Enzyme design. Structure first.
Site, PDB file in Angstrom:
ATOM      1  N   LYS A 269       1.917  -1.739  -9.547  1.00  0.00           N
ATOM      2  CA  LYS A 269       1.505  -0.585  -8.944  1.00  0.00           C
ATOM      3  C   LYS A 269       0.496  -0.294 -10.062  1.00  0.00           C
ATOM      4  CE  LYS A 269       4.356   2.132  -6.153  1.00  0.00           C
ATOM      5  NZ  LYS A 269       5.774   2.652  -6.441  1.00  0.00           N
TER       6      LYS A 269
ATOM      7  N   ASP B 205      10.435   9.224   0.709  1.00  0.00           N
ATOM      8  CA  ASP B 205      10.413   8.386   1.577  1.00  0.00           C
ATOM      9  C   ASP B 205      10.246   6.821   1.942  1.00  0.00           C
ATOM     10  OD1 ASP B 205       7.973   8.432   3.508  1.00  0.00           O
ATOM     11  OD2 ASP B 205       6.460   6.977   1.989  1.00  0.00           O
TER      12      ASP B 205
ATOM     13  N   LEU C  86      10.707  -8.010  -7.333  1.00  0.00           N
ATOM     14  CA  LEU C  86      11.165  -8.842  -6.164  1.00  0.00           C
ATOM     15  C   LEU C  86      10.741  -9.402  -5.488  1.00  0.00           C
ATOM     16  CD1 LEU C  86      14.696  -7.280  -5.974  1.00  0.00           C
ATOM     17  CD2 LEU C  86      13.012  -6.596  -7.338  1.00  0.00           C
TER      18      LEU C  86
ATOM     19  N   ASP D 159      10.014  -7.716   1.485  1.00  0.00           N
ATOM     20  CA  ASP D 159      11.011  -6.255   1.561  1.00  0.00           C
ATOM     21  C   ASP D 159      11.512  -6.804   2.576  1.00  0.00           C
ATOM     22  OD1 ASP D 159       8.313  -5.563   4.151  1.00  0.00           O
ATOM     23  OD2 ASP D 159       7.539  -7.178   2.610  1.00  0.00           O
TER      24      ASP D 159
ATOM     25  N   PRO E  75      11.730   0.733   5.648  1.00  0.00           N
ATOM     26  CA  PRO E  75      11.762  -0.556   5.701  1.00  0.00           C
ATOM     27  C   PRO E  75      10.748  -1.283   3.662  1.00  0.00           C
ATOM     28  CG  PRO E  75      12.073  -0.586   7.572  1.00  0.00           C
ATOM     29  CD  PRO E  75      11.738   1.170   6.972  1.00  0.00           C
TER      30      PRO E  75
ATOM     31  N   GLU F 204       0.395  -0.988  -0.543  1.00  0.00           N
ATOM     32  CA  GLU F 204      -0.079  -0.418  -0.015  1.00  0.00           C
ATOM     33  C   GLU F 204       0.780   1.176   0.523  1.00  0.00           C
ATOM     34  OE1 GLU F 204      -3.682   0.351   0.368  1.00  0.00           O
ATOM     35  OE2 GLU F 204      -3.723  -1.829  -0.077  1.00  0.00           O
TER      36      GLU F 204
ATOM     37  N   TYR G 274       0.480   7.535  -2.493  1.00  0.00           N
ATOM     38  CA  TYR G 274       0.388   7.491  -3.950  1.00  0.00           C
ATOM     39  C   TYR G 274      -0.122   6.187  -4.928  1.00  0.00           C
ATOM     40  CZ  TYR G 274       2.712  11.533  -4.517  1.00  0.00           C
ATOM     41  OH  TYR G 274       3.398  13.215  -4.248  1.00  0.00           O
TER      42      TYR G 274
END
Ligand SMILES: NC(=O)c1sc(Nc2ccccc2)nc1N
Length: 282
Positions: A33, A119, A75, A78, A122, A12, A15
């Site tokens: 996205k 921004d 990827l 995260d 992690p 989330e 943007y």
């Protein structure tokens, strides 16, 4: 989309939302996205040519049915999830160093191309089984503006500066570096003022001596409590002195005194840097 099969929601953001998706045609798995102007075009179109091993590749930009979709390489996981997964034992220092070093390379590249992330957190640092880590979700900030995590926000942003610099990314990365080492967020504020005061309580309330111009900042209040700086050895106890000296330079109050990503890469802390493999549970 219609050319993609949304496998699952993986993230989330202010943007938009990111989905793990499969190109119904090519069969390639990507990060799709859905974005939540014209200057946005330049801004985004730029991102496409911003290729580096430590920056998540933006594969396609789809502007159809008056909607905006960004297709990124997918990827594996995260850093937020990885840190949580490694909370009992902690991420091995060599891997923490490898990650920090790679992120600095990615930032040095972004910053040399005049791109700010704004921004870092992690959740938007993405890793793969090969030991790489990459910057994602630049968030095309500086556009759609005019709950949200404030933990990694630089003090000059919190104090109302509207023209902040690449120094804000170094600050954010410094916070992340500390967190990887201690397994606890460095400044876990839950409001802009609590964020600001947690930073002050740890680093000391800034004044004109350490930060020329701070008392003239938009949101600066003479009424701010005056806290003394805490000894750094208490801040990140398991970090060796090289690590602590680099960290202090990434967390200087004055954006102009804060170390650059390029200069950070030459810091003695990275003398023995290597590229370990993480143990990823996918
Ligand atoms: N935001 C992004 O651009 C992302 S998120 C992502 N994968 C992922 C896989 C497992 C857990 C969390 C994220 N890949 C990209 N490019």
């Amino acid at each position: 989309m219609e050319n993609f099969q949304k496998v699952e929601k993986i993230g989330e953001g202010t943007y938009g939302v990111v989905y793990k998706a499969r190109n119904k045609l090519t069969g390639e798995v990507v990060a799709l996205k859905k974005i939540r102007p014209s200057t946005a075009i330049r801004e985004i179109s730029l991102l496409k040519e911003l290729n580096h091993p430590n920056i998540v590749k933006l594969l396609d930009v789809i502007h159809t049915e008056n909607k905006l979709y960004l297709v990124f390489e997918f990827l594996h996981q995260d850093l937020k999830k990885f840190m949580d997964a490694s909370a009992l034992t902690g991420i091995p220092l060599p891997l923490i160093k490898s990650y920090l070093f790679q992120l600095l390379q990615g930032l040095a590249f972004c910053h040399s191309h005049r791109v700010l992330h704004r921004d870092l957190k992690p959740q938007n640092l993405l890793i793969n089984t090969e030991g790489a880590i990459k910057l994602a979700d630049f968030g095309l900030a500086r556009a759609f503006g005019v709950v949200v995590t404030l933990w990694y926000r630089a003090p000059e942003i919190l104090l109302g500066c509207k023209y902040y610099s690449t120094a804000v990314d170094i600050w954010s990365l410094g916070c992340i570096f500390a967190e990887m080492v201690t397994r606890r967020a460095l400044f876990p504020g839950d409001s802009e003022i609590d964020q600001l005061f947690r930073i002050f309580r740890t680093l000391g309330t800034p004044d004109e001596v350490v930060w020329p111009g701070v008392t003239s900042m938009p949101d600066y209040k003479p009424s701010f409590p005056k806290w003394a700086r805490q000894d750094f050895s208490k801040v990140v106890p398991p970090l060796d002195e090289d690590g602590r000296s680099l960290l202090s330079q990434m967390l200087h109050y004055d954006p102009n005194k804060r170390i650059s990503a390029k200069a950070a890469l030459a810091h003695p802390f990275f003398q023995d840097v290597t590229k370990p493999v993480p143990h990823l549970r996918l």
